[PDB]
Design a protein around this ligand. Structure first.
Ligand SMILES: O=C(O)c1ccc2c(=O)[nH]c(Cc3cccc(Cl)c3)nc2c1
Ligand SMILES: [Mg+2]
Ligand SMILES: [Zn+2]
Length: 292
């Protein structure tokens, strides 16, 4: 309650002051409270606070409830990963101009899902406690926080808007299962290759939202080299130490997963090229170290 008091009373700096529009944004030098203020700015500059009548102390409490339900003792899948995932979603909407292709309810759901897509994660090698089981658990935690007293940032929505938002949130979180991405990316690419891609189709739009969440989920692979080098160390720490081969594994992950995804994202909106460009540069540096 003492952390909510300093957060709710603080001033929220501009988006340019917080550097949350750059695709190269990094959270390393930031406090936990500074990331919470950046998250408020993302809700603010997307007009989500205005268009849905969010009261300030409820958004502060919800943002705080979300970051506490991430586990500090997990190297990568923690609050900083969720905060960075939502930041790239903000950058892809603003700097990538994707914001105009979507509705307010879709933007509202994408930001909430990005912050919540990995809630209560305990590490990739600590999944024994238990068709995307983890993603279903992540949404259960997201819905529980959304319904917690004092944290209902969606109270200003009609019952019609509330369920449309809830179903987009659930599909966006489930899309972060790479298994689902692998089974659906083939369709996504095959319509890009024919210029048949049409976002007015509801099946098309849901597929694009699914690929967009994967793009920001793995957006650490697109960061500048000193940043990606450190994040890859965090990933390797969680997959090894339960809390060195890395260059080879980053190149394979870039070849099999990320390259085509960011290639397809730039075809949809050319201004998200810095994501594809940054991922190519990281593949170049990881490959050079793979050759010793
Ligand atoms: O879970 C995520 O959201 C995520 C985000 C980024 C990456 C990434 O950059 N690489 C790899 C490959 C991988 C697997 C195991 C160990 C090592 Cl070192 C590398 N997996 C990632 C997974
Ligand atoms: Mg996940
Ligand atoms: Zn994730």
């Amino acid at each position: 309650t003492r952390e909510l008091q300093s957060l709710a009373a603080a001033v929220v700096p501009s988006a340019q002051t917080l550097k949350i529009t750059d695709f190269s944004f990094s959270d390393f030098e930031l406090s936990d409270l500074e990331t919470a203020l950046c998250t408020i700015r993302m809700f603010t500059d997307l007009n989500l606070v205005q268009n849905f009548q969010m009261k300030h102390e409820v958004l502060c409490r919800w943002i705080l409830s979300v970051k506490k339900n991430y586990r500090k003792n997990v190297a990568y899948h923690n609050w900083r990963h969720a905060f960075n995932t939502a930041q790239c979603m903000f950058a892809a909407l603003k700097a990538g101009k994707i914001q105009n292709k979507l509705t307010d309810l879709e933007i509202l759901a994408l930001l909430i899902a990005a912050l919540s897509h990995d809630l209560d994660h305990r590490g990739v090698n600590n999944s024994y406690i238990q068709h995307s089981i983890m993603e279903h658990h992540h949404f259960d935690q997201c819905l529980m926080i959304l319904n917690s007293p004092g944290n209902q940032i969606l109270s200003g929505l009609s019952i019609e808007e509330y369920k449309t938002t809830l179903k987009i949130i659930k599909q966006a979180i489930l899309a972060t299962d790479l298994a689902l991405y692998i089974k659906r990316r083939g369709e996504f690419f095959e319509l890009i290759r024919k210029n048949q891609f049409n976002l007015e189709d509801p099946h098309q739009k849901e597929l694009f939202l699914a690929m967009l969440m994967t793009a920001c989920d793995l957006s650490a692979i697109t960061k500048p080299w000193p940043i990606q080098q450190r994040i890859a160390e965090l990933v390797a720490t969680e997959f090894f130490d339960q809390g060195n081969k890395i260059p080879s594994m980053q190149v394979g992950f870039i070849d099999a997963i990320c390259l085509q995804l960011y290639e397809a994202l730039t075809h949809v909106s050319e201004d998200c090229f810095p994501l594809l460009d940054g991922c190519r540069k990281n593949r170049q540096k990881w490959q050079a170290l793979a050759e010793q």
